[PDB]
Design a protein around this ligand. Structure first.
Ligand SMILES: O=C([C@@H]1CCCNC1)N1CCCCC1
Ligand SMILES: O=C([C@H]1CCCNC1)N1CCCCC1
Ligand SMILES: O=C([C@H]1CCCNC1)N1CCCCC1
Length: 330
């Protein structure tokens, strides 16, 4: 089997991407944030505290003939931006882009934090990291990808995110029309439950490439590119007037600037992030200070190749027995 679904930015800055997902019988379509940095499929639901729902589409398990309470199971997750959610669990039929998993754990939110409530366009998350991070207790549950894997033509999924445009998540096949040149594969460590890999270095704009190992995760659920302070300082030093602002919470730059590109290494290959991809616009409406799309990972504890980096590439998440990651230009 295979699946193919379009993923669409939620706003003009590509702050996140949503992908339609069919849950239950008859289908209830919710728009989920596909997150290769976590491993819970959770949704706004008929059980979510009413005051915490503001425009989201909800899953109602009582209206699904295939829904079954997973008795005694609960979940609770805290994300790296300080957001959180928790609730109980149903199993139901879940389909993505034509690919169907029966008996998928669908985690029904009873509580969500304010940042979820405030984002009316995101109806929940679909985790695509390794199932060892799944928070369901007392019986840990598998991700949609892990459940689908054995049925897929090939044990892979791909992320092809757009810059200010829709893109695609494919399951079970590599679309050879969706990228240019060849795909470079690189080793993955699953020790922390993430798609964790080591970049071979970077360049700023037209500058020379610096060979240096940068361990980090491929995380479609993180908006920005978070890298070591040394690397980030070298980038922003090439932008007149850029500075790190503790009051704003990161690097800002004059909105009048033309940003340089940023290149990262994948083995001997190179992925170029155009300068425009690094512009996240005014810090507040009408401001002439703009927020940077490359930020320091210091204090996070891990480097994160988020959407700013991933959308510059066609990315293969290879879930073979020894997982790997592939990157191609596009
Ligand atoms: O919570 C997260 C991210 C949040 C955004 C969505 N992807 C998962 N983590 C990844 C980075 C290290 C801390 C854990
Ligand atoms: O929002 C944040 C951090 C970055 C700034 C310091 N506190 C919040 N991140 C995005 C999600 C993955 C971890 C990094
Ligand atoms: O994370 C987004 N923003 C916070 C920093 C200023 C711009 C908006």
């Amino acid at each position: 089997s295979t699946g193919s679904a379009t993923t669409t930015p939620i706003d003009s800055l590509d702050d996140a991407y949503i992908t339609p997902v069919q849950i239950g019988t008859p289908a209830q379509t919710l728009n989920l944030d596909f997150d290769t940095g976590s491993s819970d499929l959770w949704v706004f639901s008929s059980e979510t505290t009413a005051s915490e729902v503001d425009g989201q589409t909800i899953y109602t398990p009582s209206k699904s003939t295939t829904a079954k309470l997973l008795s005694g199971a609960t979940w609770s997750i805290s994300y790296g931006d300080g957001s959180s959610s928790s609730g109980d669990v149903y199993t139901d039929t879940v389909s993505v882009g034509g690919l169907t998993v029966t008996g998928q754990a669908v985690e029904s939110a009873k509580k969500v934090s304010s940042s979820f409530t405030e984002d009316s366009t995101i109806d929940g998350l679909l985790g695509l990291a390794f199932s060892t991070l799944n928070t369901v207790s007392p019986t840990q549950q598998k991700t949609f990808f892990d459940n689908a894997k054995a049925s897929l033509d090939s044990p892979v999924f791909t992320a092809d995110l757009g810059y200010h445009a829709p893109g695609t998540y494919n399951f079970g096949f590599i679309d050879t029309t969706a990228y240019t040149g060849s795909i470079t594969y690189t080793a993955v460590s699953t020790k922390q439950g993430f798609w964790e890999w080591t970049s071979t270095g970077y360049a700023v704009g037209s500058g020379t490439f610096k060979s240096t190992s940068i361990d980090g995760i491929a995380d479609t659920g993180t908006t920005l590119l978070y890298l070591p302070a040394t690397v980030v300082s070298a980038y922003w030093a090439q932008v007149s007037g850029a500075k790190s602002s503790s009051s704003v919470g990161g690097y800002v730059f004059p909105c009048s600037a033309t940003l340089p590109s940023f290149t990262f290494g994948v083995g001997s290959a190179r992925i170029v992030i155009p300068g425009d991809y690094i512009d996240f616009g005014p810090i507040s409406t009408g401001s002439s200070s703009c927020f940077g799309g490359i930020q320091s990972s210091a204090g996070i504890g891990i480097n994160i190749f988020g959407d700013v980096a991933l959308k510059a590439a066609f990315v293969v998440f290879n879930g073979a027995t020894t997982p790997t990651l592939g990157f191609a230009s596009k």
